[PDB]
Amino acid sequence: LRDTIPDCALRSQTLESLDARYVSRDGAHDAAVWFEDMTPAELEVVFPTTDAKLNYLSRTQRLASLLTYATPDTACVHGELLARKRERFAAVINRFLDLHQILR
Amino acid sequence: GDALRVPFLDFATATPKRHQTVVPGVGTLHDCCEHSPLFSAVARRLLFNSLVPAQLKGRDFGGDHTAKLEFLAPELVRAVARLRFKECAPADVVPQRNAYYSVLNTFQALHRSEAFRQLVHFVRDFAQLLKTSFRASSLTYGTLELFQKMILMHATYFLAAVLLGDHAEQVNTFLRLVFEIPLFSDAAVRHFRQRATVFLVPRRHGKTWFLVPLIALSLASFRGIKIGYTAHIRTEPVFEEIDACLRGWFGSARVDHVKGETISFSFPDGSRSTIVFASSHQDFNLLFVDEANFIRPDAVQTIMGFLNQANCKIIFVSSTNTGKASTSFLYNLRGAADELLNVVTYICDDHMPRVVTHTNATACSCPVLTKSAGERFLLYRPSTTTNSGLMAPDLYVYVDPAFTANTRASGTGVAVVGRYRDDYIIFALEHFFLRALTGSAPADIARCVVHSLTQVLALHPGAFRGVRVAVEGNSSQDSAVAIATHVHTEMHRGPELLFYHCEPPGSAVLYPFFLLNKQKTPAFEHFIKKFNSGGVMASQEIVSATVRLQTDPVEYLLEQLNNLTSDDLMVAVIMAIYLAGPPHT
Amino acid sequence: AAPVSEPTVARQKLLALLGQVQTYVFQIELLRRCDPHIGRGKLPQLKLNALQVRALRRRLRPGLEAQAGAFLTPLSVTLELLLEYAWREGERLLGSLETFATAGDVAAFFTETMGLARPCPYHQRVRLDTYGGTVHMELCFLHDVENFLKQLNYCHLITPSRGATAALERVREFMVGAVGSGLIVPPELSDPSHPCAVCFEELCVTANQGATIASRLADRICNHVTQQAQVRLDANELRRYLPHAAGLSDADRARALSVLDHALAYAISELQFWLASGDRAGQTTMDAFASNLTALARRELQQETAAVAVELALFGRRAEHFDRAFGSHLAALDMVDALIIGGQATSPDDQIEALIRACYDHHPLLRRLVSPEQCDEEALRRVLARWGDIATQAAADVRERRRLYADRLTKRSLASLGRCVREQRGELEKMLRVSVHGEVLPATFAAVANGFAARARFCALTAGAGTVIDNRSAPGVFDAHRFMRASLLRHQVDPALLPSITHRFFELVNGPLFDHSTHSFAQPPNTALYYSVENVGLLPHLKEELARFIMGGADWAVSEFQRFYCFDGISGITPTQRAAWRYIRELIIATTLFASVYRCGELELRRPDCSRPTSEGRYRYPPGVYLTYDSDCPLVAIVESAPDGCIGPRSVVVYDRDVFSILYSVLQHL
Ligand SMILES: Nc1ncnc2c1ncn2[C@@H]1O[C@H](COP(=O)(O)OP(=O)(O)O)[C@@H](O)[C@H]1O
Ligand code: BEF
Ligand SMILES: [Mg+2]
Ligand SMILES: [Zn+2]
Ligand SMILES: [Zn+2]
Hints:
By secondary structure, chain A is mostly helical.
């Protein structure tokens, strides 16, 4: 039941070499389904909560999904959807403010 | 109950305790696994799939499991049984085991609640009695119609929240499963929890065939809960039928009743739930109002008073006929209400949308612009006189003339529109009717449009650099030209005035009229799309001289628009907007 | 009561493994935005996890392969998607971090990982390949995958098995890229205005005050294929968590808290361009929204400065994540483009509250808004109880029409006002809040693949096990087929049976997705088919030809001699379905007449889409004549299978293309 992290510990050895030498071998038993912890410490001091980490992960996703749609594909129907959604949300928030301005 | 009795599954992990959470059935997982409904809604259903009894999995569900939720191939189970985790942290094994077994003990304690045993004895007994189509079996199928399932959901989701309050989330999920409607937004399931809901079933569709089994099984399963009931003409058939079925599929020694009055079902204890009948005129919790279109006063007072209670759900299941479909007592309620009454109709709003709900009809018994867009349109109007910076500097005016008098289709339509942000806004409307036998119909029409424009100009001074005017010439080219000429001259008393011009076929002349033909379908198509998405609105200070002595101009326009499938104003509005090839000076 | 069935422990192990894989794919979606100088530090952990996923989807690869071919389940589908996407992203992130340290460029690494230069990998083709023509669409969004799956369930009675499996593989290959993240659902593929299959099922069921259901599917945000997850984030977040950080020396932690305490000591300008009606001078709602947004900007900038300072104190390096390495492209966006995306120190709920604390202030209408239940209650109570002159006249009429408009907005239309305000608030919340994912796509994918793989598995499983007496190869089967046809074309339909044909017809024209007739709260096949037919928008001139397709010596002998389930002549999607309906009605009426003339046995006219597997690999196909929807071997009659039920050594079956040949071979064998 020896774990994979205390099995191989050395220099780069590009991933396919490790796959060939350690786990693709048929003589192995394939125990040790223990994953590892990949999130760093410099990313926990500033986002110290799964909620805050998820919010940041969503903010950067919403930004990337704007930078890619801003060689001449020029239609990229996802881009037209993302422009229609923004131009709809703008009008909707403006009318939501204006209506309650009028209700007084 | 099988998935509740599972051992620890040691299952070591690397995430710090400051993040990990305890999902039931499984060990301790990172907090992200509680935010993703992809895994949460699976680890939550494979567990509640054990509380659901074996008589509520379906007709064909598998041997001894809900095979469409818990099925592992005979090769994947043998390849999974050889998977082994880190299995431990000796200083950290005991707390995780304690937490997991504590959550599972909470679940098991939920399994043993008497009030939950009653809800099970209700839903299981109902799905079992329904197998025989509610015959007199002591205890080809009896499929429920749609509303005959909505009534059951309305009763069960209420009595669940009333009898079992300390288990809101768990019983909510259990009922979502048992009705075979999982992945339902909690807004709908919450709507099921409301009281005082109204039904409207057509006769001979089945309302008493389903009520008396509902009444009988809401009596015999639950304990100590009364059940109201009221009708105008003295309920005797339903009462005798309830007596019959209860004495049939339960011990007749248990039922005790006096004719036309309280029926009571016995129990080992002194629970003795009752069906006291209020037809002949405390805590009821159902108050099944069986007829709600024929009530006499001094009998509505008990119903208005029971609304003051917090445990009664007055169900207004009342029949309709379609000869009196617009009941003087309920069909008006659909005006000012929100998720209160649900009609059971097969010929919907229009004269013949029946082909839509045709397949929905019982087998035994054998609008271009959306309303929301119209309500939003009239409901919200932007103030143009104070948001002039949002407007484009061009006005577009379309005149759709009719050159007759003393006719209902003799109205001239005029619209003055512009761009507002990237949307379109109406500044003025006219529905103008020639005085009979005037000598100057074009000038009368011109004076009407000029007066409208002027008012719009005065309300927004300095806003507009251009006004572009189209006079439809389909009716008469000469008469359209005459209108343009009078508009031209009168406006000569700043913004530049430009007319749309047309070079008629075979001609080299550019006339100041507009010919409506090939551009109609694109114009209408674009309008419908824009209007429906909230992109066309009316100015809060919209101008109209001709619609100022009987109805609101926007309300009037909307009545014409709702004929899309006298149209002068609709055409002018749609075409003015379409206009907003180059028109010129 | 001690031993629990081994499938239950295997399912618990699979749930734990799915949770671990989800955690790993969350760490991956984190390291795709972290500084490469830190990705190089976490390189060994990422390599170890990639090795783990590789060695993991080889112990489950034959298992999941056998599973896909036998009754897929939401757990298995979700696990396959997560394992495949985790493998993909692990290999890609490792490659992109090892490409770094050769270029040493951060902006390049971010344009690579976050996919800023990729050529839109969210396009796919299907090529449904039905009979009578092969219709091909293009999956782009998520609701498009949902629509295609519903379309396949609808036209399930024409498409063959292998074509359906090919289309379903090319759909799962797109779901791996879209539903693979399972946590953030990038906005390039989401259109909440499109209601999914469950919005219709929960709009048929909830209240409908008139308002034909086709008129309600236009306002719904559908809230199911992309949920909201309601993330909440405190104000002084890191200061709460810095004293108890992991692996920090007490001296460093103390001086870091000191630097934090010391350092603690949007596009608002573009609001005036918005259409703001009402009074211009004074306390208005647009100025209140501007002040709320300015306060939120102050909070976020303060948090960012504090974070930079504490990182300079603890590690000494101002880390460059995807919001600090692309701050040039950021901080230049408009008001709306900063509202949609933004707030790494706030939450979308904080933006919602900053807007609503500005709208709802100091006011009838708010009472209806806060509690609509009491509003409908009072409604029910009330129901039960019951040039110069031009300018001056313009000012006067605009005055008397603003007054009337405000009078309407305060007195009447309150139903419409409440509904519109609620819908606007919903359209705001669905746009701002973090969409995570939904549980509709794997559910429907499993529900459709189950039916199709079940048809294929029955076609392959009844191959042998006994006599396979075939009637598609015709020695003289004409002689015994025309006789039975003439013997059944003689009697009347006996309309006292139509309430059974009209049900056993919709029980076959239906699809495997919408059960709604085996729920144990079963609804008739009428509604069970109305769901699967109205969801996939059908022409109303076809919806009546479903209901009225049995009300009427022909019309139940429309098949030729050998070509019963054969659409060689016709082409299209509507006429192919019409011929399918003709053939199915013919089979049903033939079975009913055969029962009403001959008393040999029962047929019960079953379908292979039923017979879900038991605890392990057992199917027990009961006796009867099946439909099988296969143009190569449509009719399969199991005259007698076994004492247990499964197709065993004594399970003689009869293949045939010819319905009456089956009805004669059943009689001969029974
Ligand atoms: N889906 C159904 N399930 C069971 N019975 C049904 C169904 N549809 C119609 N029926 C039949 O309709 C009748 C019910 O009529 P009933 O509810 O008494 O009419 P009313 O609404 O006028 O009181 C019964 O004969 C019942 O068998
Ligand atoms: F359909 Be009835 F109440 F005669
Ligand atoms: Mg009757
Ligand atoms: Zn694209
Ligand atoms: Zn939806």
